Amino acid sequence: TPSDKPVAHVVANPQAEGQLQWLNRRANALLANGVELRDNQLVVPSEGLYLIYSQVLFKGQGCPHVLLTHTISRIAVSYQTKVNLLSAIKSPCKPWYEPIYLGGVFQLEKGDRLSAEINRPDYLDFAESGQVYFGIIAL
Amino acid sequence: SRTPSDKPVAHVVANPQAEGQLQWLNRRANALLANGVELRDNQLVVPSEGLYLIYSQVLFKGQGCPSTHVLLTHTISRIAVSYQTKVNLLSAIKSPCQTPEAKPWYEPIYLGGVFQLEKGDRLSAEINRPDYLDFAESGQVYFGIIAL
Amino acid sequence: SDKPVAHVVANPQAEGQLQWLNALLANGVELRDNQLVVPSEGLYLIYSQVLFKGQGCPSTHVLLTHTISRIAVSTKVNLLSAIKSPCKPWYEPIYLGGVFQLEKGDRLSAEINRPDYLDFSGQVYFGIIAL
Numbered sequence: 001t002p003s004d005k006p007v008a009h010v011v012a013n014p015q016a017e018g019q020l021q022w023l024n025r026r027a028n029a030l031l032a033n034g035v036e037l038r039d040n041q042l043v044v045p046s047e048g049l050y051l052i053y054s055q056v057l058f059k060g061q062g063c064p065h066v067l068l069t070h071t072i073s074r075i076a077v078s079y080q081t082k083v084n085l086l087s088a089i090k091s092p093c094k095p096w097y098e099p100i101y102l103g104g105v106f107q108l109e110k111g112d113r114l115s116a117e118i119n120r121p122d123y124l125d126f127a128e129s130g131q132v133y134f135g136i137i138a139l
Numbered sequence: 140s141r142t143p144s145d146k147p148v149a150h151v152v153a154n155p156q157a158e159g160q161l162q163w164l165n166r167r168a169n170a171l172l173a174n175g176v177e178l179r180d181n182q183l184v185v186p187s188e189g190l191y192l193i194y195s196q197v198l199f200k201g202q203g204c205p206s207t208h209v210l211l212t213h214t215i216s217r218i219a220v221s222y223q224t225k226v227n228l229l230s231a232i233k234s235p236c237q238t239p240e241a242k243p244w245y246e247p248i249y250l251g252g253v254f255q256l257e258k259g260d261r262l263s264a265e266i267n268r269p270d271y272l273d274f275a276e277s278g279q280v281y282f283g284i285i286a287l
Numbered sequence: 288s289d290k291p292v293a294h295v296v297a298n299p300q301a302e303g304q305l306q307w308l309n310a311l312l313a314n315g316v317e318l319r320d321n322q323l324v325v326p327s328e329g330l331y332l333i334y335s336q337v338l339f340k341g342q343g344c345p346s347t348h349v350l351l352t353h354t355i356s357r358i359a360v361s362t363k364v365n366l367l368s369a370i371k372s373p374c375k376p377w378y379e380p381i382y383l384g385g386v387f388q389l390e391k392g393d394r395l396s397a398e399i400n401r402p403d404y405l406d407f408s409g410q411v412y413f414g415i416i417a418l
């Protein structure tokens with residue numbers, strides 16, 4: 001009996017310039033058991049504990065002040081507010097690479113919307129698959 | 140209403156009110172204890188033996204670089220019921236400053252590992268420089284466990 | 288639990304390679320050729336961490352990669368991947384994890400480019416759990 005747990009694993013679009021845009025219609029990417037992708041956000045179908053996670057990979061050629069941020073955020077349907085669940089900031093300054101992996105476990109409610117965002121889509125690297133992704137897993 | 144997991148889990152966050160310290164909270168938006176995990180005297184208390192993922196992120200920040208050399212540490216340690224003394228499980232150390240008389244710098248430190256824990260283990264997550272901790276925003280500083 | 292599950296750890300005693308030792312292997316999961324073998328079809332959480340250490344910086348530009356690949360029972364495809372540029376000892380972890388639909392017989396690898404910079408506790412591992 002295949003699992004009926006809500007899950008998603010969405011991957012960023014390498015050819016969407018100036019954007020961090022999530023896709024499910026790609027190999028090894030997934031929306032299942034009720035999770036939707038709407039206006040670049042993952043929409044939670046039932047209340048419960050979830051794992052939530054995201055990775056980005058940044059890359060520059062040398063150093064010109066560069067700040068890199070990555071942030072997962074929650075909009076609760078009741079509260080109608082957008083607040084940071086998981087967030088990091090790096091100041092990296094020959095090519096440099098900065099990956100940022102965020103993960104944690106959270107109580108969410110039906111209708112919650114989650115986003116995963118960055119401040120410098122121009123520094124995103126897409127050289128290989130699996131470098132830039134966003135997901136949730138119902139416990 | 141699907142069956143909740145009964146696995147012990149916790150994700151606690153820095154108290155953004157407690158400037159100059161690192162105080163973990165579960166009584167805070169988007170922080171949690173479940174299935175027997177407790178937060179007592181700033182430590183996480185394990186309700187049953189087994190493998191757990193233990194993770195923490197802290198974010199340090201400064202305005203330029205000072206005359207004394209800055210060392211930033213983050214340490215997760217274990218106090219077992221059978222040996223009630225802090226033992227380091229995970230640690231890291233960073234030197235954010237490698238400035239003539241002031242650009243901000245940020246140093247995020249993540250610690251993660253999978254460990255066999257015992258019932259009643261107390262887990263601490265601690266830094267040496269709370270004066271450099273940044274809680275300008277939620278989601279930056281946290282400490283959690285997930286029983287496998 | 289009947290769910291396939293594995294958590295394997297790196298041999299701190301191997302020479303310039305990343306060798307996984309079984310740590311858990313249960314309910315059909317196997318370790319063959321340093322790869323995990325999927326006993327049945329479905330959703331898996333897959334996760335890994337590796338740690339790197341070096342004493343100071345060299346004149347070769349050091350790039351550290353870590354990558355988890357799916358080898359279809361049916362060819363190797365990245366599922367999860369990252370890269371760090373480390374350049375006084377320095378220390379750098381790389382940590383990965385996500386949820387994937389897999390098929391009976393798929394193999395999974397967890398590899399690095401520079402085993403000579405491995406740092407060897409409770410922190411170098413590879414694993415899966417059926418959801």
Ligand SMILES: Cc1nc2ccc(-c3ccc(N4CCNCC4)nc3)cc2n1Cc1ccccc1OC(F)F
Nearest residue numbers: 051053103104146192286287334335382383384385416
């Ligand atoms: C880098 C890493 N190391 C890991 C080690 C273990 C697990 C993990 C997380 C959950 C879990 N289960 C099975 C047991 N009950 C809880 C769900 N089992 C294992 C996740 C791990 N991750 C990735 C990760 C970290 C923090 C939160 C979520 C994570 O993974 C997932 F979200 F992709």
